[PDB]
Amino acid sequence: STGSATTTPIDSLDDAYITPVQIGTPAQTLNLDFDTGSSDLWVFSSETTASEVXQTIYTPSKSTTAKLLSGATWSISYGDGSSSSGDVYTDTVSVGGLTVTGQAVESAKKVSSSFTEDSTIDGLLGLAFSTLNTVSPTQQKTFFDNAKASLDSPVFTADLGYHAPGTYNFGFIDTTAYTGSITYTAVSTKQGFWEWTSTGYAVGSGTFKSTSIDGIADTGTTLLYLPATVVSAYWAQVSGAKSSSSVGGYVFPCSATLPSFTFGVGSARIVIPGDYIDFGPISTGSSSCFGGIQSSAGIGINIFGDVALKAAFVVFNGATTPTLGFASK
Numbered sequence: 001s002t003g004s005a006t007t008t009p010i011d012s013l014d015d016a017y018i019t020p021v022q023i024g025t026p027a028q029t030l031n032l033d034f035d036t037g038s039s040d041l042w043v044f045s046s047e048t049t050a051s052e053v054x055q056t057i058y059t060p061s062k063s064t065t066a067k068l069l070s071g072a073t074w075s076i077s078y079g080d081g082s083s084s085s086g087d088v089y090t091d092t093v094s095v096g097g098l099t100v101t102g103q104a105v106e107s108a109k110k111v112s113s114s115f116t117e118d119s120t121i122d123g124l125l126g127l128a129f130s131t132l133n134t135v136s137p138t139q140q141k142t143f144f145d146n147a148k149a150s151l152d153s154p155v156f157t158a159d160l161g162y163h164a165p166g167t168y169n170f171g172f173i174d175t176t177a178y179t180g181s182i183t184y185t186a187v188s189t190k191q192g193f194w195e196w197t198s199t200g201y202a203v204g205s206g207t208f209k210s211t212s213i214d215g216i217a218d219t220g221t222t223l224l225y226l227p228a229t230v231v232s233a234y235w236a237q238v239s240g241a242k243s244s245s246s247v248g249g250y251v252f253p254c255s256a257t258l259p260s261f262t263f264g265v266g267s268a269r270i271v272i273p274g275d276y277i278d279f280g281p282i283s284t285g286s287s288s289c290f291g292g293i294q295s296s297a298g299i300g301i302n303i304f305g306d307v308a309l310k311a312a313f314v315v316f317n318g319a320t321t322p323t324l325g326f327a328s329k
């Protein structure tokens with residue numbers, strides 16, 4: 001089997017992407033944030049504290065296939081400090097025509113303020129390794145782990161657009177969606193992430209420096225977070241850019257034409273166009289814009305977030321020994 005779903009940016013900044021997911025029988029359609037940085041599928045629901053709901057909710061009691069997973073609970077917090085918790089049902093879940101029976105659907109009893117305030121995200125679908133799932137006492141498998149037995153090939157691909165829709169495919173590689181060939185690189189699963197090592201970087205039309213950069217491929221993070229000295233090297237080429245303590249990172253004049261940024265995948269090179277690094281104005285009508293490449297020093301891990309992934313066709317190869325593939329597009 002295979003599945004193919006359109007994913008759409010939630011706003012004009014590409015802050016996040018949402019993908020429709022059908023849950024239950026008859027299907028309830030929710031728009032979820034596919035996150036390769038976590039492993040929980042959780043949704044707003046009829047159980048969520050009413051004052052914290054502003055979103056489309058899942059109602060397990062209107063699904064004939066929903067089953068309560070007795071005595072299971074979950075609690076998660078994310079790197080930006082947001083959190084949620086609740087109980088667990090199993091139910092039928094379909095993405096793009098690909099159906100999984102018996103999927104753990106984590107129902108939120110409580111959600112943090114950030115979740116309440118974002119009307120466009122009805123929940124998260126985690127696509128990291130199942131060791132990071134937060135259900136207790138027995139962890140639950142991710143949608144991808146449950147689908148692998150049925151998939152034509154144990155892969156999914158991410159084709160995120162720049163201020164445009166893109167596609168998540170399950171079970172096949174669309175050879176029309178990229179150019180050249182795919183280069184694969186080893187994944188370390190020790191921390192539960194799609195963790196890989198980039199072979200170097202270049203800024204604009206300058207030299208490529210071979211330097212290993214360990215980081216994670218994370219669809220659920222907006223920006224590109226890299227070591228402080230790499231990031232300083234990038235913004236040194238932008239005459240009006242400065243690190244702003246009040247805004248929380250590097251800012252630059254919106255009128256600037258930004259240099260591209262290249263990262264290494266083995267012997268291959270992926271080029272992020274300068275325009276992708278212009279995240280946007282710090283506020284409407286401002287003359288100052290926020291940068292899309294920022295320092296990872298405060299995070300503790302380098303993150304190849306949407307700014308980087310949307311410049312590439314990305315293959316998450318879910319075989320027993322996983323790998324990550326990148327192609328230009």
Ligand SMILES: CC(C)(C)S(=O)(=O)N[C@@H](Cc1ccccc1)C(=O)N[C@@H](Cc1c[nH]c[nH+]1)C(=O)N[C@@H](CC1CCCCC1)C(O)(O)C(F)(F)C(=O)NCCN1CCOCC1
Nearest residue numbers: 015016035037038077078079080118132218220221222299
């Ligand atoms: C709107 C920025 C002004 C560009 S922002 O950073 O706030 N954007 C958020 C994403 C966003 C967009 C739109 C609406 C809401 C949220 C962002 O990029 N968040 C990152 C920031 C980060 C990472 N690390 C340090 N800081 C993040 O937490 N991403 C997580 C998924 C997000 C969470 C908020 C809602 C959207 C999905 C994440 O899962 O990708 C993660 F990998 F970073 C992470 O937190 N992984 C959680 C690991 N769990 C921990 C518990 O044990 C199990 C493993």
